[PDB]
Ligand binder design. Structure first.
Ligand SMILES: O=P(O)(O)OC[C@H]1O[C@H](O)[C@H](O)[C@@H]1O
Ligand SMILES: O=P(O)(O)OC[C@H]1O[C@H](O)[C@H](O)[C@@H]1O
Ligand SMILES: Nc1ncnc2[nH]cnc12
Ligand SMILES: Nc1ncnc2[nH]cnc12
Ligand SMILES: [Mg+2]
Lengths: 237, 231
């Protein structure tokens, strides 16, 4: 059940074009235009169509569990980003028998917490929002994987790298299910702190080629706002 | 393990359940000075997710409960953001969709929005139209059930599609808040026969599993530069 990666940019890996798991993603991943999306990027890849497909979810789980089980030196923690990284990390961490550590927006986490620098995303300019992690959840002897759903500009991953760096831990790999390689999202993590993390592979199972013209999820016709009330929805039962 | 009905249709693990005993050792609570929310005892979910044995116990309990049914469950619906930590690992083992119930401006497509809701500490939940339908048999899942306002928002969305609500599931039920009441009184009591099942309850929060750092000086939020001086 092994699936194969190809290095498409330096330390940016994605599944081969012919990979059976990629073909499964191609049938389920849909993108939405600004008219039907919470953020007006050209093609918004809704994670719910992935979580609604248990076969693809199992393929994601199996890929990363097998990958990290077969390392010569095991990982000790998986760190996942609020909110969509939360959907992917725990099912991997439970099979590896490692902690799943939450990286959360402001302060959401109780106790003593470490805050990143203010982050940016493909669709978010810098503001006061930072990512945080619980102090004491991992340390300088930890070997960690950062996981999210999408890697676009790499701003979110940079915030995670800053938090890993704040504890002196070893960053083994950055993991996701969709990498928009034309945005070169490896760059922030790979140039932070004078290149301290340039040897960290990014592994995103599929890439922008999954967001094909035939994979638009927009309704072909829809009355009014995409946001409907419960009473309006009941008339469609 | 075995469940005890502590309030009408509000079930939790027995006092001697081995899984309850594991929760007792792992769960920590935080006072308002060390928590993001103004409640006496805030039960941080990160201490659960950091313990793979307890996560496996949670997953195995619900997978075992919901498998091999005469009428199978068709979908697990989980709440943004902490329900997202629990639902997928169960759904993958049951081989069913996990459906996101999300806060505003989070799901793409045509979406159904609930009435405004409140929590223990305006704002509405949403679900993608077409993720489930009147023939679905669904479980709602979250980490904590407190006032039940969040669960009521989920019930409204399930009701909006005519689906069968099979069960309400969580890991921590604060029974003194009687969180069954919003869901069980909605629409004239239409869902009053739906059990709430929360693995543990407020008795898991004792004097001895308080997580407050009793010696920490200054702000509980530290910068990366400050954290590195502690390495
Ligand atoms: O930071 P970027 O790489 O630009 O964008 C990816 C992030 O933005 C969205 O919240 C995704 O779920 C990821 O957390
Ligand atoms: O709505 P309540 O039952 O009062 O509070 C429970 C919710 O409040 C917190 O976000 C928890 O994660 C649940 O989603
Ligand atoms: N294009 C995109 N689609 C979905 N989630 C994203 N997060 C950042 N960019 C995204
Ligand atoms: N006391 C509490 N602890 C953790 N999460 C909660 N959500 C609502 N009430 C809560
Ligand atoms: Mg968000």
């Amino acid at each position: 059940h092994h699936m194969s990666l190809v290095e498409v940019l330096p330390n940016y890996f994605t599944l081969s074009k012919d990979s059976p798991l990629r073909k499964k993603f191609e049938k389920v991943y849909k993108w939405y235009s600004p008219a039907f999306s919470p953020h007006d990027v050209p093609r918004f890849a809704e994670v719910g169509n992935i979580t609604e497909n248990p076969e693809v979810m199992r393929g994601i789980r199996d890929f990363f569990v097998d990958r990290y089980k077969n390392l010569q030196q095991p990982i000790t923690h998986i760190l996942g980003f609020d909110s969509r990284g939360f959907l992917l990390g725990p099912m991997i961490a439970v099979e590896l028998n490692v902690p799943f550590v939450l990286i959360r927006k402001a302060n959401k986490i109780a106790g003593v917490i470490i805050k990143s620098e203010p982050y940016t995303k493909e669709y978010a300019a810098e503001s006061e929002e930072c990512m945080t992690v619980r102090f004491g959840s991992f340390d300088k002897n930890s070997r960690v994987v950062l996981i999210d759903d999408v890697i676009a500009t790499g701003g979110t991953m940079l915030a995670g790298v800053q938090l890993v760096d704040a504890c002196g831990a070893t960053l083994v790999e950055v993991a996701g299910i969709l990498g928009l390689t034309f945005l070169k999202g490896t760059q922030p993590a790979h140039t932070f702190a004078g290149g301290r993390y340039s040897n960290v592979p990014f592994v995103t199972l599929v890439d922008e080629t999954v967001l094909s013209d035939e994979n638009c999820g927009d309704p072909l016709h829809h009355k009014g706002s995409r946001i409907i009330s419960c009473a309006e929805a009941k008339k469609l039962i």
